[PDB]
Amino acid sequence: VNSFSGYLKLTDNVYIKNADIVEEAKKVKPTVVVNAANVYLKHGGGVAGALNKATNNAMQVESDDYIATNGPLKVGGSCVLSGHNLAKHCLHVVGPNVNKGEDIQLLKSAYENFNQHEVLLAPLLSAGIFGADPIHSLRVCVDTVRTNVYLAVFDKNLYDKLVSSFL
Numbered sequence: 001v002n003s004f005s006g007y008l009k010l011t012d013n014v015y016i017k018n019a020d021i022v023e024e025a026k027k028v029k030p031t032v033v034v035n036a037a038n039v040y041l042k043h044g045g046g047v048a049g050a051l052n053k054a055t056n057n058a059m060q061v062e063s064d065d066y067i068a069t070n071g072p073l074k075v076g077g078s079c080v081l082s083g084h085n086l087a088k089h090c091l092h093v094v095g096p097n098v099n100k101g102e103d104i105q106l107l108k109s110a111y112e113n114f115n116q117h118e119v120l121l122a123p124l125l126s127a128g129i130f131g132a133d134p135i136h137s138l139r140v141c142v143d144t145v146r147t148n149v150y151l152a153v154f155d156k157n158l159y160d161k162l163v164s165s166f167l
């Protein structure tokens with residue numbers, strides 16, 4: 001038994017809730033929150049900017065030190081950093097950004113990073129301002145992640161569309 005509440009069961013291991021991932025992280029303080037990162041860990045907008053804002057920019061400060069030491073991530077890759085006030089850890093995962101010309105096949109590789117963690121709070125990857133179809137992202141998630149994933153979908157009209165079209 002874990003502390004996630006109000007989620008709809010999608011599979012044996014995938015759950016989905018119409019909620020704001022930041023407000024969810026603040027309430028649950030999960031072991032792992034996933035950030036929809038870019039390879040530079042530049043948290044301007046989307047989930048990244050919202051998570052970073054909720055950390056009072058501490059996420060960005062830590063991220064800049066990480067990049068200065070290690071260089072950029074790979075598209076499809078990840079790194080584990082602090083969760084600051086939101087979670088024990090933040091798993092920064094780089095899903096391909098369609099609008100930037102990044103290959104969509106890399107979405108499966110991105111979701112494979114989730115399998116290194118028993119339980120995660122996560123957004124959908126590669127959707128929103130990353131430019132790919134959210135129904136597709138949910139399908140890849142369900143077909144790739146084997147650990148327990150709690151998906152927070154803030155967009156009300158999208159949440160309903162994802163549930164109603166889920167096979």
Ligand SMILES: Cc1oc(C(N)=O)cc1S(=O)(=O)Nc1ccc(Br)c(C#N)c1
Nearest residue numbers: 036046123124127128129134153154155
């Ligand atoms: C409001 C919304 O729209 C879509 C869509 N395909 O239009 C997804 C979402 S989300 O907020 O619920 N989760 C989410 C996940 C990842 C990213 Br990156 C963003 C952004 N930026 C948002």
